[PDB]
Structure formats: C-alpha cells, structure tokens
Short mmCIF file of C-alpha atoms in Angstrom, two decimals:
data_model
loop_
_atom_site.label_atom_id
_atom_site.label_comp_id
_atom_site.label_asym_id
_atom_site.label_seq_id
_atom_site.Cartn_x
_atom_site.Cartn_y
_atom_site.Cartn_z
CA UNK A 1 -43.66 -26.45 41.80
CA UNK A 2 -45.00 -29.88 42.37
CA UNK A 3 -43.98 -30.64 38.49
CA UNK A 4 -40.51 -31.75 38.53
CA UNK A 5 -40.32 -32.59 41.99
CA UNK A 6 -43.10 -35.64 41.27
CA UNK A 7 -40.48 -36.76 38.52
CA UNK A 8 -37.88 -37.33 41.62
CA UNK A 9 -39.83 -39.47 43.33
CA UNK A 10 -41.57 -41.52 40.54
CA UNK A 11 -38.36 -42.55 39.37
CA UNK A 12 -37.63 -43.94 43.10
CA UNK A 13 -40.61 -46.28 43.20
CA UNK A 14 -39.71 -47.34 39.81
CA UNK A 15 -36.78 -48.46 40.18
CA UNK A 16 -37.04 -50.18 43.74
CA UNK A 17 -40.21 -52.20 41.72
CA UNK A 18 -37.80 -53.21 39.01
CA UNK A 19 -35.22 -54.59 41.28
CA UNK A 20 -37.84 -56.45 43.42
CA UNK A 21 -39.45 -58.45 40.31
CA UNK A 22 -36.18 -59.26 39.56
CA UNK A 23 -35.75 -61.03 42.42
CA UNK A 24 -39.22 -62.94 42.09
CA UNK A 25 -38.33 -63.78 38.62
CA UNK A 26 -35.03 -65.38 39.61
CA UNK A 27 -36.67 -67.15 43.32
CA UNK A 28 -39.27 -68.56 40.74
CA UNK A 29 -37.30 -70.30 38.46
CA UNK A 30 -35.21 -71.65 41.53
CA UNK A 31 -38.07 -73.21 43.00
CA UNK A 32 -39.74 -74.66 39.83
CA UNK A 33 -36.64 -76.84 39.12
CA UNK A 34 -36.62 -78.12 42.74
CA UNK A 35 -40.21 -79.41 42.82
CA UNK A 36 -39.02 -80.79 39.02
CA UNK A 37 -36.62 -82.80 40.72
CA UNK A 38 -39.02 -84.27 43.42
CA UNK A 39 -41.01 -86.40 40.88
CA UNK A 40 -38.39 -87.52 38.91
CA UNK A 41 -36.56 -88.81 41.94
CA UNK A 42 -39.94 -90.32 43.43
CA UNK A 43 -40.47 -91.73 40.58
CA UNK A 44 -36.90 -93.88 40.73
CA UNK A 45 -36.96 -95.96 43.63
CA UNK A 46 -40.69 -97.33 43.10
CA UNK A 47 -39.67 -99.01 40.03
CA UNK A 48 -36.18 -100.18 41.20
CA UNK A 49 -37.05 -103.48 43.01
CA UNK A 50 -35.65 -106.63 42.68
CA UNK A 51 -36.44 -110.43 43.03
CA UNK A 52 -35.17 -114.09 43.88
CA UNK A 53 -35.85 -116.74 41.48
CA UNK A 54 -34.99 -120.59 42.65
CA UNK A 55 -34.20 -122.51 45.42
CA UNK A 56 -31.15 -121.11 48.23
CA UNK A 57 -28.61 -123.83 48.31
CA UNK A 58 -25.90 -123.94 51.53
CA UNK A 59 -22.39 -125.93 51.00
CA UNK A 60 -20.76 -127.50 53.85
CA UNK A 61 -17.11 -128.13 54.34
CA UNK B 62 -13.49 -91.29 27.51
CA UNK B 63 -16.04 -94.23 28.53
CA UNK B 64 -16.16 -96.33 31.50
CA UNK B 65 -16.32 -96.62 35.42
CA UNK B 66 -13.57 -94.16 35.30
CA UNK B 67 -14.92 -92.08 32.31
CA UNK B 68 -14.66 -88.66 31.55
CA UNK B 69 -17.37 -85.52 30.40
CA UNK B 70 -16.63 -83.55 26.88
CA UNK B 71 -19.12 -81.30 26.52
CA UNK B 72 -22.79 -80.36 28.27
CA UNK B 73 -25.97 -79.39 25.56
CA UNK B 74 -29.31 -78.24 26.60
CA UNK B 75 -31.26 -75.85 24.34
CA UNK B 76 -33.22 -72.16 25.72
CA UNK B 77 -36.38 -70.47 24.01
CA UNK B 78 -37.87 -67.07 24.75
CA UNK B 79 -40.80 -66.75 27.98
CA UNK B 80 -44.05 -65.05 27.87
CA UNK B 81 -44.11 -61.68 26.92
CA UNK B 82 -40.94 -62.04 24.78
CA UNK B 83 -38.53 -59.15 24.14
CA UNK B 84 -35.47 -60.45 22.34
CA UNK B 85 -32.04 -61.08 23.81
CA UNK B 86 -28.53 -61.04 22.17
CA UNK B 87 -27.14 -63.91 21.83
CA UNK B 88 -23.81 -63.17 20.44
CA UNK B 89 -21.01 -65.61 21.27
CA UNK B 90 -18.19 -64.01 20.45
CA UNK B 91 -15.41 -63.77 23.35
CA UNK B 92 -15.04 -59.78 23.37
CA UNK B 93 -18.68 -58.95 22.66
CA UNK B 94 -20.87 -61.62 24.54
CA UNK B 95 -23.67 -60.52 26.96
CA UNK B 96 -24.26 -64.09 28.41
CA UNK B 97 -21.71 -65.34 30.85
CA UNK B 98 -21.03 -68.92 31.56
CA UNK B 99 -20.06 -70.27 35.01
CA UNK B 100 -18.87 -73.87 35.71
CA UNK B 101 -18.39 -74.90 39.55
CA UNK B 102 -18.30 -78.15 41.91
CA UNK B 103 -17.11 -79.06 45.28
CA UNK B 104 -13.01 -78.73 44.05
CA UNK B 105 -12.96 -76.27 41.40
CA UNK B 106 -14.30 -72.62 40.04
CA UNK B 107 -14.09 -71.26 36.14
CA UNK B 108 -15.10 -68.26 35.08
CA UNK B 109 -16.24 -67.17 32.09
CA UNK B 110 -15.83 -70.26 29.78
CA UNK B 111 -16.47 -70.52 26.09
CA UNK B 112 -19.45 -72.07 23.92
CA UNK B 113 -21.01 -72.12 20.92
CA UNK B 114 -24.95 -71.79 19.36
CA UNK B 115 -26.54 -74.02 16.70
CA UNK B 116 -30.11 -72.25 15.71
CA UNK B 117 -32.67 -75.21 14.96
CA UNK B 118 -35.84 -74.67 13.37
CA UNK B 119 -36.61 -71.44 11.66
CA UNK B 120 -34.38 -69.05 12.00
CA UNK B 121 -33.43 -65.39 10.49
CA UNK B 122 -29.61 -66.01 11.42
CA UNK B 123 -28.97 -68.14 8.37
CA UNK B 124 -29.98 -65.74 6.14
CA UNK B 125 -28.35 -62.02 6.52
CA UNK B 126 -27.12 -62.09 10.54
CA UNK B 127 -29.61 -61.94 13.14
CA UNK B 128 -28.56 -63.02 16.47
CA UNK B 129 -31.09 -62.07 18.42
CA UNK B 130 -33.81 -64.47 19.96
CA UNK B 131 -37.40 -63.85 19.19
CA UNK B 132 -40.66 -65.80 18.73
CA UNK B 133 -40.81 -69.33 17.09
CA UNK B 134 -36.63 -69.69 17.03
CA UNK B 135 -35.11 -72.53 19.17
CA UNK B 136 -31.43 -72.02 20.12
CA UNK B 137 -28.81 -74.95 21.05
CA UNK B 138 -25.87 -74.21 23.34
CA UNK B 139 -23.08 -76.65 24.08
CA UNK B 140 -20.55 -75.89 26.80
CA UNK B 141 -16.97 -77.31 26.46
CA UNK B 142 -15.27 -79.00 28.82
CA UNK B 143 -12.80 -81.21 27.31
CA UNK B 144 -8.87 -80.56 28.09
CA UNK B 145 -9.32 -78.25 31.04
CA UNK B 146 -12.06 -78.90 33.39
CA UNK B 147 -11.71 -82.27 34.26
CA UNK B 148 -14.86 -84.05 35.08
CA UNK B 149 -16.20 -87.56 35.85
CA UNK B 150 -18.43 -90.05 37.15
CA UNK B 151 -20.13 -89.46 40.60
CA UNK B 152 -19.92 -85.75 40.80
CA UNK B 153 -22.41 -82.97 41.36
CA UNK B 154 -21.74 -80.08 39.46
CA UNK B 155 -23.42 -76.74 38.44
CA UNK B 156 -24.02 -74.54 35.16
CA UNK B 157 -24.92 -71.24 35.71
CA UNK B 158 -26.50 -68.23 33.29
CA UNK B 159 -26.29 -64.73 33.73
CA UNK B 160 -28.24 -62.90 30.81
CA UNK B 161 -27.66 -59.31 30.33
CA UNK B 162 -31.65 -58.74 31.80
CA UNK B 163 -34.30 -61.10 32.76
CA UNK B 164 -33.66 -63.94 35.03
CA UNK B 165 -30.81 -65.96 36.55
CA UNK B 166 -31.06 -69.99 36.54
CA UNK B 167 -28.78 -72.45 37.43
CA UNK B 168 -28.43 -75.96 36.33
CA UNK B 169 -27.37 -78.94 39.50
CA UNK B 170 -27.17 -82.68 38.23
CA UNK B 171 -25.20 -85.51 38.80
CA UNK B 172 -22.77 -87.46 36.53
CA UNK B 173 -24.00 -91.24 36.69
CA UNK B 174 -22.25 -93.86 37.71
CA UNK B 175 -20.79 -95.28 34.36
CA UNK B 176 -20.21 -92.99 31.53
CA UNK B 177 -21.41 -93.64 28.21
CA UNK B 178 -20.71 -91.63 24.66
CA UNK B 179 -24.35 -90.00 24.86
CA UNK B 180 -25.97 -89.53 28.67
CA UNK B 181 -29.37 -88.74 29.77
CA UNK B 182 -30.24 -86.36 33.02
CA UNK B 183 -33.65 -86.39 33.20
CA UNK C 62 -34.69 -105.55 6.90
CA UNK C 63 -36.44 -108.49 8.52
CA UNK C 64 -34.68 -111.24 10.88
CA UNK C 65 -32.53 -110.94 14.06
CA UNK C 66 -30.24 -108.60 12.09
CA UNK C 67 -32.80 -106.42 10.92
CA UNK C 68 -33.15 -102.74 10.92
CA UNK C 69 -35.48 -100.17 11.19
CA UNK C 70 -37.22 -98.03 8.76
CA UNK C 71 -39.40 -95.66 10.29
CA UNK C 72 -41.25 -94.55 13.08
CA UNK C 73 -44.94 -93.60 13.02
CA UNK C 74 -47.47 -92.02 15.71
CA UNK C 75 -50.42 -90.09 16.00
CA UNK C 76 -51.27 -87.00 17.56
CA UNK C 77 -54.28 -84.56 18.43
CA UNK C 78 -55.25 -81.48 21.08
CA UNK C 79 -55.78 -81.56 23.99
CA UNK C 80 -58.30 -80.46 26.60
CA UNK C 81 -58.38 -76.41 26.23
CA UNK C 82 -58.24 -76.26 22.69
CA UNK C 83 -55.93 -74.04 21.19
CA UNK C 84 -54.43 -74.19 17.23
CA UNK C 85 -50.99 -75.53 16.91
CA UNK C 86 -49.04 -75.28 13.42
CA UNK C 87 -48.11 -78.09 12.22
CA UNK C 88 -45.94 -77.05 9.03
CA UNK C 89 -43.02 -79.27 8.25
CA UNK C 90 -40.86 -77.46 5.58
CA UNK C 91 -37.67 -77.29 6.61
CA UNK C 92 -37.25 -73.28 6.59
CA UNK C 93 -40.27 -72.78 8.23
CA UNK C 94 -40.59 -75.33 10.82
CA UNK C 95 -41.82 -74.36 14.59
CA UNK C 96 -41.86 -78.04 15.91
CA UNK C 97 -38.35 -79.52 16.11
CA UNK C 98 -37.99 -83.72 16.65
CA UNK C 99 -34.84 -85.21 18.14
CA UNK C 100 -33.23 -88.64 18.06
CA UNK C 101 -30.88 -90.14 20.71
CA UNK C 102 -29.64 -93.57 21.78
CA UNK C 103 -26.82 -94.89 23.75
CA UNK C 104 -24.18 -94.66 20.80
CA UNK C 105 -25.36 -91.46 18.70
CA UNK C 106 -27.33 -88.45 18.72
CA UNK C 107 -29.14 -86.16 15.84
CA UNK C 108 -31.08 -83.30 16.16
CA UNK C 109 -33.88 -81.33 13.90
CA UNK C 110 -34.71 -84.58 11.19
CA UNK C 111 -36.94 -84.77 8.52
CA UNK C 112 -40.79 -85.82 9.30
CA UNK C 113 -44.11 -85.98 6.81
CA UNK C 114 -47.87 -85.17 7.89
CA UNK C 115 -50.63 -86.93 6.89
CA UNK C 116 -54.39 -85.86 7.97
CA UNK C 117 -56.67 -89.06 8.73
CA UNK C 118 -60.80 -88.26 8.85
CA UNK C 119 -62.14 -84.84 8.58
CA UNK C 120 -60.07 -81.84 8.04
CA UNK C 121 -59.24 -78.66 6.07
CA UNK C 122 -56.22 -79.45 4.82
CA UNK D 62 -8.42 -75.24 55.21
CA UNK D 63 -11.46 -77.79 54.79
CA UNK D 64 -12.34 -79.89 57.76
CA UNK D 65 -14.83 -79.36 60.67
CA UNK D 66 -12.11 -76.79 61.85
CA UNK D 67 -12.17 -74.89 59.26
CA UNK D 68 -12.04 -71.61 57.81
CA UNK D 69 -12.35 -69.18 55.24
CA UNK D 70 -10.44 -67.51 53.05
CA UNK D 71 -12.55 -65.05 50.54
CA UNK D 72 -16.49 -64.00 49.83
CA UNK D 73 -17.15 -63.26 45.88
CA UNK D 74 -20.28 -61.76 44.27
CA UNK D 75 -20.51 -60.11 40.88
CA UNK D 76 -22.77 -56.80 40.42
CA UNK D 77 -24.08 -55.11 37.17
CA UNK D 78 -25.99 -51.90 36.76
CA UNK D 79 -30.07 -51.55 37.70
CA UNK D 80 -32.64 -49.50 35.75
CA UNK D 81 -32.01 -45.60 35.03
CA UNK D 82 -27.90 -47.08 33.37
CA UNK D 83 -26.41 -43.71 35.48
CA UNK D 84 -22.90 -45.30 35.49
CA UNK D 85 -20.75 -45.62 38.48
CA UNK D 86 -17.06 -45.49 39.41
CA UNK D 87 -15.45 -48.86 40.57
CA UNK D 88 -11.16 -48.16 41.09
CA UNK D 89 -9.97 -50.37 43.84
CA UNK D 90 -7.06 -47.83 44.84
CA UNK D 91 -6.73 -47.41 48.17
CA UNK D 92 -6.00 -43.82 47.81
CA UNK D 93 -8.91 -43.00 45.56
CA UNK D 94 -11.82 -45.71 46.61
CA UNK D 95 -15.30 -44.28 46.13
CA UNK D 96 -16.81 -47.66 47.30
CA UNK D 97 -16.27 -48.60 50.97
CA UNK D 98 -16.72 -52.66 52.15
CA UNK D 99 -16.98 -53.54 55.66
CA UNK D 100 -17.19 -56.61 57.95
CA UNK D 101 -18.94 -57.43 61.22
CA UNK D 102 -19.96 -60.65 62.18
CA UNK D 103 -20.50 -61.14 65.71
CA UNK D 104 -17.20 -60.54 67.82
CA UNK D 105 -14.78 -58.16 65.50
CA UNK D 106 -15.58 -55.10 63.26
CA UNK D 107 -12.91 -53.59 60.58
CA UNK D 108 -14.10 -50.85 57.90
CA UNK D 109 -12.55 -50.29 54.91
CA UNK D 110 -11.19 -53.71 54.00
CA UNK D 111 -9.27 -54.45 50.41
CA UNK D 112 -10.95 -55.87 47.32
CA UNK D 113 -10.67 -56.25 43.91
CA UNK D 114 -12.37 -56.00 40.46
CA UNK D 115 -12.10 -58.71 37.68
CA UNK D 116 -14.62 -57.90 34.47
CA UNK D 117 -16.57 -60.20 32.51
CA UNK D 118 -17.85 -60.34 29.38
CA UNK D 119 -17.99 -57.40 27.63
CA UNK D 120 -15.96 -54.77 28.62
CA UNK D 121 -13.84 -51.41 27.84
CA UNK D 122 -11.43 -51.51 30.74
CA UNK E 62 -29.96 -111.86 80.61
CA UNK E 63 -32.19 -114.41 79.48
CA UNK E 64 -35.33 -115.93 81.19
CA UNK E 65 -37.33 -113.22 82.67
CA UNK E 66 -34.48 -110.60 82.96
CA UNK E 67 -33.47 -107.32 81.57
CA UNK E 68 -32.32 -106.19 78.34
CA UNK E 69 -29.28 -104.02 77.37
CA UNK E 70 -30.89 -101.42 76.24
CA UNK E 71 -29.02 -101.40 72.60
CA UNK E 72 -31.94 -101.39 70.55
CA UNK E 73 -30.36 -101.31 66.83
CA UNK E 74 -31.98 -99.86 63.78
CA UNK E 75 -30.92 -98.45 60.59
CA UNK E 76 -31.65 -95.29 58.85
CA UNK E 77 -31.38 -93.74 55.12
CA UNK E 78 -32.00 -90.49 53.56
CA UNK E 79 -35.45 -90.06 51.28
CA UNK E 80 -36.07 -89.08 48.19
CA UNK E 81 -35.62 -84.92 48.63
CA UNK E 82 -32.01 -86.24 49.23
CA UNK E 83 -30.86 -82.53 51.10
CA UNK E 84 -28.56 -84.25 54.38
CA UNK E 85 -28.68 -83.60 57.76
CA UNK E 86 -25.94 -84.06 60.25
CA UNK E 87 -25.52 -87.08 62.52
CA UNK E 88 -22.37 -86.14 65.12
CA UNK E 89 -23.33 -87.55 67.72
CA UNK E 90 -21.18 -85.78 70.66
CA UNK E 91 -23.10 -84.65 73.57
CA UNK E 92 -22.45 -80.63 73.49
CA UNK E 93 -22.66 -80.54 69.54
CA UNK E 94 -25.63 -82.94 68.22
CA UNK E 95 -28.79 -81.33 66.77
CA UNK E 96 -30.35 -85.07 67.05
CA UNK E 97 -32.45 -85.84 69.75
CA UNK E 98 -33.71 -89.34 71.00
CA UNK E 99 -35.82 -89.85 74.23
CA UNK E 100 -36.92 -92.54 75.74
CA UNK E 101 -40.93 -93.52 76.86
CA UNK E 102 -42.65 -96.12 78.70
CA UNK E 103 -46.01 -96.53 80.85
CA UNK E 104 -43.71 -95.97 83.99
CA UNK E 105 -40.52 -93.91 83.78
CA UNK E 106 -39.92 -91.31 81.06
CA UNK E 107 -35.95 -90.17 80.07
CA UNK E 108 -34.78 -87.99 77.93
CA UNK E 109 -31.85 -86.37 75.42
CA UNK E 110 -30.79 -90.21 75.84
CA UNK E 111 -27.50 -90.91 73.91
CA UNK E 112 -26.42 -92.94 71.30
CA UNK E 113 -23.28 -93.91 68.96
CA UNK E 114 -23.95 -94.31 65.32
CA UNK E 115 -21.57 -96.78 62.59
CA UNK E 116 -21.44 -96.22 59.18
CA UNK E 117 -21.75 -99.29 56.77
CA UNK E 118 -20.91 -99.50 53.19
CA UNK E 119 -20.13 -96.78 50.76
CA UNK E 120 -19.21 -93.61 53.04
CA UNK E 121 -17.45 -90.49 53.10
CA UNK E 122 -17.17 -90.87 57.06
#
C-alpha cells in the first residue's frame, strides 16, 4: 500500500519547505533595511561641509 | 525631558499588510497578545513590554470589533518607555517584532545628539 | 496672516502617475480614506488630517 | 565580566511551534526532562546541562 | 637628519571609518593584530612592519 505511506513522506517535504521560506523571508527583510541605511548615510556627509568667510587675524603678546 | 542630557518617552512607527495578505491579530491586550515586543541595547534587556494601536484610515475596528489587519487598513503602534527603561542621547538601541507567523524584523537606530520633543530617524 | 508674525493657511501641491501606469484611489472621506497625510515639526506632531481634491484639465470625475 | 578578558555567563533563544501544531512537552525537571541541551565548543564537552523556561505572550501555563 | 640624510621612518597619517560605519579592530600588539602594514621600495622590500596607533578626540579607548 503505497497510499498512506506517500502521506508520510509528503508531509516531511512540506514542512522542511515551510521552515526554509521562513528563513528567506526573515534574511530578506534583514538585508533590505541594511542597503536602506547605506544611502541615507551616503547621503549625510556630502552635504555636511563647511566654509571660512573673512580675513584670519593673529594677536601678539 | 529635552536637552544635551535629554531623555526618550515613547518610540511610533506604523506596519501595513505585504503581498499576498492573510490577516494577522493584532490584539494588544497583556494576556491575549500574539505580537511580542523586545527592547535591548549595549546595558540592558526587557522582555515583553507593553504598547498600544491607533487604526488610521479606514478601518472596521471602530465600528463592531475587528482587530485583525487586512487590505487598505494602516495600523499605528507606539512603544512606551517612559519611567522604566531609561534612555538617552547617543545610544544605539533595538526594537524587535515577533508576529505569531510571517516574518521577524528588527528595528537599529541611534538617538541624536540633542533631544528634542518630536525626533526624526530617517 | 501677512508680516513677520504671520501664519500659515494652507498647503497646496499637485500630483499625477507615474511611469507604469496603474489606478490609484484617490477618495478623501474620512471613513473611507486609503491615503493617510501626516504633519510634523520640531514642537508638535498630528497624524491622519483633513485634505480636498480638485481635478485640473481632462478627467472623469 | 566585560573587558577583553572576558567571559560569559548565559546563551538565550526563544522557540515556537512549526507547521503540522503536534504539541510538545517542555518541563525543565531534572528528573522528568524530555528535552536534552548539550555543549561542546572546542576543548570541553558536558551533556545534559540545566535550563529554564520563561513564556511569553499568550499562554496557559 | 637634515641635508642629504635619512629619515626616521615615522611616516604619520590619520584614518576614519566610512560611511557603512561596521568597526574593525586596531590592537596593535604583535601576536594579536589582524592589521597588516608592509613596507615597498625599488630596492629592499619588508614586511608585517609595526606600528603604534594614538587616539585623538572623542574616544572610547
């Protein structure tokens, strides 16, 4: 009887497939926010540069 | 409390369903909630804390009781942080989300460097 | 209110679609809204207020 | 005891039921244990270390 | 030395993380560092060279 034995083993492969695209589903989101964070950072430091205006002036004692 | 030596109240970002959508209980109350809330940085570990939902948008929960969260509703969570957890400015810290099924996400940013009443992490 | 004490009224923009066309709703009464609009600022915050639609050039509205 | 020197002290993880729901027993007696933990890492082996179970959420225990 | 002489070879330079932002470590004793500097020139070649590093400003050092 090939019937209920097949309903053993489907079950496995089931199973081990549901745990597995848990896993993607959870790596995914991890790596989504990382690459999220790159451009925003990037984005920072190009903007953040500063200036002089005027003359330098020394003092001597 | 605002300053160079401020202090964080509270923490608010807002969830929607994914593709594919299948609803998911959203239930707040502390002896039948399916979402657990983890707080944790480099000096301390909670478990388990407490928050509350504000539905925005259109909604079935204002009318009879729905509580689950299905297509076109927009949910608002704020976490509580207040009198416990102390908290304050240049600190990394992370949120993280367990829902009953689906996916685990965390949530890593950085308090600025002088706390003001409303704060943006982009 | 005009002058260096003034304050503002309202805030108006313009939208349309984008590249690979797909219908977006666009109803605004307040039970049956499916695009929410925020406010912030350094001192407050509200969420989900009040917003008008009016269609400019050809349409079937 | 943080430092360079250091070392550690305990190693949490949570767990939750997969797909198929067939429950499981989790009693951290050590005279009736159905769940055995062990630890190797490179130098030292010992079986049967203690644990225990704290529940979250939604519960009946 | 000045003139036409030698030079301590203390060449100086300063370094900063980028915008990823993940650290690395910078311990620079002999049996432990994971950083490696070598030395080239168009007639002698030496390498695993070492070096002392100083931290300046803000630092959890």
């Amino acid at each position: 009887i090939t019937a209920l034995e097949t309903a053993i083993i489907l079950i496995a492969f089931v199973v081990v497939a549901s745990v597995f695209a848990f896993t993607i589903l959870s790596a995914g989101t991890f790596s989504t926010e990382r690459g999220k964070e790159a451009v925003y950072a990037g984005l920072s430091e190009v903007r953040s540069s500063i200036e002089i205006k005027g003359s330098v002036v020394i003092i001597g004692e | 409390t605002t300053g160079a030596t401020g202090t964080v109240d509270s923490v608010i970002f807002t969830v929607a369903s994914a593709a594919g959508g299948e609803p998911i209980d959203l239930n707040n109350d502390p002896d039948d909630r399916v979402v657990v809330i983890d707080y944790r940085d480099a000096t301390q570990r909670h478990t388990d804390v407490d928050w509350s939902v504000t539905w925005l948008g259109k909604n079935d929960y204002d009318t009879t009781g729905d509580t689950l969260l299905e297509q076109g509703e927009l949910a608002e969570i704020t976490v509580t942080l207040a009198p416990t957890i102390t908290l304050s400015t240049n600190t990394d810290f992370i949120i993280e989300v367990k829902p009953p099924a689906g996916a685990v996400f965390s949530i890593q940013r950085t308090t600025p460097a002088y706390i003001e009443t409303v704060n943006d992490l982009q």
